[PDB]
Amino acid sequence: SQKMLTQLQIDYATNTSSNTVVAYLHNVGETTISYLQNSVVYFGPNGQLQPVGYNSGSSPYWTVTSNSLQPGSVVKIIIYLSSPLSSNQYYTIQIVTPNGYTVSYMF
Numbered sequence: 001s002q003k004m005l006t007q008l009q010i011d012y013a014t015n016t017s018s019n020t021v022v023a024y025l026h027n028v029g030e031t032t033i034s035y036l037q038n039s040v041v042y043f044g045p046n047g048q049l050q051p052v053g054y055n056s057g058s059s060p061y062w063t064v065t066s067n068s069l070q071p072g073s074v075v076k077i078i079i080y081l082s083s084p085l086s087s088n089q090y091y092t093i094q095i096v097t098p099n100g101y102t103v104s105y106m107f
Helices: none
Strands: 008-017 020-027 040-045 050-054 061-063 074-080 091-096 102-106
Touching: 008 091, 008 102, 020 091, 040 074
Parallel strands: 050 061
Antiparallel strands: 008 020, 020 074, 040 050, 040 091, 061 074, 091 102
């Protein structure tokens, strides 16, 4: 019953330099998010997402320094893309955290 009790949100995300995207994941609920590095990440343009492997050695992949997200905390997720972003497409970040909560952000 813990998916309904959870609240997470991506406060902000942007392409910082080269083909790197940074997203700020913020626990705005009252439950701890465990095993953050076991989350599943998808990313892509125009509603067609690609899986992004955790620290997998090949792009696209993502990194995060924390392995848990306490209530109130925010962490920086870094996504290393294989293709440069186009200004004429919209992009979606989709995350499924271990407990099955899903959070997304478009920019």
